[PDB]
From a paper:
Potassium channels propagate electrical signals, maintain membrane potentials and facilitate numerous downstream cellular processes. [name].1 adopts the canonical fold of a K+ channel, with inner and outer membrane-spanning helices supporting an inclined, shorter, pore helix that supports the signature selectivity filter.
To covalently constrain the dimensions of the hourglass-like constriction, paired cysteine point mutants were introduced into [name].1 upon a cysteine-less background, in which each of the three native cysteine residues were substituted for serine or valine (C262S, C71V, C119V). Following purification of A133C-T136C and S129C-F135C, covalent linkages between adjacent subunits were generated, either by direct disulfide formation using Cu2+ as the oxidant or by the crosslinking reagents 1,1-methanediyl bismethanethiosulfonate (MTS-1-MTS), which forms compact linkages (CysS–S–CH2–S–SCys) with slightly more tolerance than direct disulfides (CysS–SCys), and dibromobimane, a rigid bicyclic molecule. To visually inspect the channels for intact crosslinks or unanticipated effects on structure, crystal structures of two of the [name].1 adducts, S129C-F135C-MTS-1-MTS and A133C-T136C-bimane were determined. In both mutants, four crosslinks encircle the conduction pathway at the Tyr132 as anticipated. Both revealed electron density bridging between adjacent inner helices, consistent with the predicted covalent linkages. The cysteine-pair mutants were assayed under identical experimental conditions to wild type. The differences in rate (and overall signal) between crosslinked and reduced forms of the pore are not significant, which indicates the enforced constriction is not rate limiting.
Numbering used by the authors:
A (entry chain A), B (entry chain A), C (entry chain A), D (entry chain A): 12 to 26, 35 to 293
Amino acid sequence: PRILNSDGSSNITRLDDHYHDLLTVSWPVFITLITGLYLVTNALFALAYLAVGDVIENARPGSFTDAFFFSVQTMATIGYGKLIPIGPLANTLVTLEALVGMLGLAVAASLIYCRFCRPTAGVLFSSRMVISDFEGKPTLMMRLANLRIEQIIEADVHLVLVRSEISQEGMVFRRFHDLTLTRSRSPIFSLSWTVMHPIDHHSPIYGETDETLRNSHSEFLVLFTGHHEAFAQNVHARHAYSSDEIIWGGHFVDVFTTLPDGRRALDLGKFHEI
Amino acid sequence: PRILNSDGSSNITRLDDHYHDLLTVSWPVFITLITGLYLVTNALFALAYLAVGDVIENARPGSFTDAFFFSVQTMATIGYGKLIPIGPLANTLVTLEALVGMLGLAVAASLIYCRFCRPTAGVLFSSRMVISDFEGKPTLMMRLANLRIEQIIEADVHLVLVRSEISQEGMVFRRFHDLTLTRSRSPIFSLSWTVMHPIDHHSPIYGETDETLRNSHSEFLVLFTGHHEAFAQNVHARHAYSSDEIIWGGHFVDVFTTLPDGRRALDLGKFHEI
Amino acid sequence: PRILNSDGSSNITRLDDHYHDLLTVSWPVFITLITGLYLVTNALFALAYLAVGDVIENARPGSFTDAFFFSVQTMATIGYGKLIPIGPLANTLVTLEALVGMLGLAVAASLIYCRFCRPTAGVLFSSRMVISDFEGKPTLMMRLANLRIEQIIEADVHLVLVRSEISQEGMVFRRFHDLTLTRSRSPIFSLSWTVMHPIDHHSPIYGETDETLRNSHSEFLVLFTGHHEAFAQNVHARHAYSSDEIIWGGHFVDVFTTLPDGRRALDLGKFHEI
Amino acid sequence: PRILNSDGSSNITRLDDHYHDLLTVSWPVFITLITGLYLVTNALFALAYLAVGDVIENARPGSFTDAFFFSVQTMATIGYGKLIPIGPLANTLVTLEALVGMLGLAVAASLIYCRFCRPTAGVLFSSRMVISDFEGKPTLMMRLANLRIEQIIEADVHLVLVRSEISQEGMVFRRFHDLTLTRSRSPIFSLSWTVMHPIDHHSPIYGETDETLRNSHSEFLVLFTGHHEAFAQNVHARHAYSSDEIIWGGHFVDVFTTLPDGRRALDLGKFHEI
Ligand SMILES: *Cc1c(C)c(=O)n2c(=O)c(C)c(C)n12
Ligand SMILES: *Cc1c(C)c(=O)n2c(=O)c(C)c(C)n12
Ligand SMILES: *Cc1c(C)c(=O)n2c(=O)c(C)c(C)n12
Ligand SMILES: *Cc1c(C)c(=O)n2c(=O)c(C)c(C)n12
Ligand SMILES: [K+]
Ligand SMILES: [K+]
């Protein structure tokens, strides 16, 4: 019955988005798609030439081979000069094809640039959360790791409790309780950041149990935002956990430890370790 | 007499913006415009060649057909080699035309990319607003829906009352009262967000009536901002309502409901439902 | 002796930035510069060919005309086929020239796009400021006008007093007192926004006079920021005033007024009117 | 044992990122790399043609010279018309090569644009920090200088103490104490900004000494952010200092001074001067 899946995406069911598709497909699929149109549009132009007749020098009438490779030479602006258009109709088709060719190039280039500036937030989230005595006070925790060689500026993470509540009006709704963190922004997120919500008497989760979290349909959202180093621009990552993914009394293993010389170093093997 | 129309744009009358125009026209209009210049500039170059005389091989003197398709072959960098320039003047025109051709390409490409990164904030606003007992306390509400498959990060919406007020100096002005919301930022805007302003004793709208809202020229602005999922960058949407578009005692129908299996799903048919 | 000029730029004297230059020059200058290199690089390549000898078909040995137009045909990828390279040296120069040609295109295109996305904050600031009785309380004011057809989202303006002060340590410095405004953010900046700082007992400028403002070297900075409508991205504008540019008891004329039908309309003639 | 090096990067040891590499290499290296692939891909295509046999007009069978320069003429879309493909296989290779050529162009262009919009935060940080009596109160200071002709909008700097602390649970961790500054945001960063943290009774560093700072492993981070003038977009700079890089009782020399006429001017020689 869980609200938001672990990836942050929700279990809410939806009752031709080409934009989204073109940007999300893997690079091999994209190249295939680009090529697919490229071959198809050249084929449509080849058919347009032969529908005018044998309007191509070096071409045999009815030969798609000659028409297609002439279309390519035209669209691609090669213009070898062996296969050349004949008549006003063919020359008009060439004028339209050349416009298409260099215009499409512009379209492809904007796609490629946009696929290059994909905010690949190389952040790793802990498999589960813990609620343990910190300073002797019970505290809710999970952690993040920067997998990229790079660093993140003004990294602001929020621990958001999304739980179902009822009003005196009778309306049932889910409200987003932003939790008070020990650190809400790590101006430099470069290592592994353990995010903590101390459970004080003001805390929205004060006094809750495994049982009451389930009964309140308690769902914990982790929203991560930050400005990448090599990139410049923002990167965003999300993860969500249910009450079932919380470890009572749980303690994480510090990923940072000291080398023989005395220098501190990070072991990401120890990331999912409690 | 309403201040801001429902789209957010105002009824304030204005007493050659090509930039704006080129970006706002529909894609068919844009393609036509791009083509329009393309044909016109090739025509101007064709005229420039014939003004030099018969400076083109394969061309008849006075033939615009030959000059135009030679211009296209030049601007588009095809260079078949059938129609070729004759003399220093023609060759200088070719050098300028080639610069124009590849330079314009750059201009078109920047237009196309900019038309692709149009923040299409796929947000749907409720037709009207309501003021109903929430928790038994009267509360002002309206709602938003994400029509895009995607999600929105750090979505901050503001309910802004723009009403006319008078000072002891005698100046009449409209001030923007930002209203205290139950949720002012939905870190993840993925479903339908019902925005609420509880009308408490501190609220700027405490104790107002349909009558007094009209007399105070009360106008409600809804400003929506958020960072798109597939996009990365910000999207923005706005809507405005007058006192006449407010429903006293009105109650929205929850768009979220439970499937046979038990999973929650959203019915956007029920969006404009009170 | 004034700190910051009216444009926001300072009177502080500086005791080959091509980037900045290429973006700031007017469009005619930019086109001339682009053309300038284009002609120069083609000339350098033409010289490179003739330094190899008569390595061009249709060319006379020693003819720069033939070499230059062959260079253009190569760099621009025309490849008519009349003037063609001879030998491994010429063909190597062609391979380098073709790389240069299409690579430079990429360079030019990035310049053009960047010159297109110049945040042209079409904001107009009032010539002077005023300090007048508002609600009977003395208040410091100036105003802004959106000259663009478009609107601005989350427009946050700050009235910053930059005045010289001295410490018990003896250090003299200028500090940036951010002033409490009646409206610090106009979520929708579409018309003319009059920015006001009420001079209360907590205000940093409480009780100052024309005389004491001059003696404290009081300088008022206006920083404007907002997210453009047709653009999407941020626009920024700045203006600064000295104590000498402040009008004591001054009152602006409202730019908004009512048409015969009853609709409100804006008269920007009345902008610089006190 | 110092946590973060003076550049902001940390001494934490890491226990094929082409993206990062392509953007970070110097311009000469990038041009060499672009050229490197360009030559290699043309060589692979040349080999592909000769593997089909003597499928090129003007070419000698087995001549890589002819095949390579034909490949260049094809990939670059020159199409002189001297060397032309023979057969369906060669013509198919040409169709793929032309796609590769103009597609790669798009790839290169996105790289070049991205290398152009490198946020070169031309900010200079003071070599060391000082802790001196300001207003008679001990205060922690360092300073920034804008080396670029340009200015920076909404410049927000944070003085972050990263020190090791221990909990009642026994966990040892480093926490990021954001220090209260005299100025935390210089809406216009144009000159030299001296950042100060007054050491009051609430300050996290109140009462610390050179000795106790070392023993608490006190590390001072300086995070700088701002929106560039000619750029538009954000720029970011960072620097970090250890307790060993702090000067007790230290006083900076003002970089701003008055010319003969009376105008204020900045001497950056005096930047690293205490
Ligand atoms: C265009 C581009 C390249 C080459 C790259 O590596 N990435 C980034 O990291 C950003 C910020 C962008 C844009 N892209
Ligand atoms: C360039 C581009 C493409 C291909 C697209 O779908 N959209 C977006 O969603 C963004 C953010 C941009 C830019 N564009
Ligand atoms: C690329 C471009 C165009 C065509 C334009 O009008 N402007 C804008 O308004 C923005 C935001 C950008 C970028 N440019
Ligand atoms: C594209 C570009 C150019 C030409 C330049 O100088 N810089 C900047 O300053 C920005 C903001 C960008 C992008 N680039
Ligand atoms: K060509
Ligand atoms: K040719």
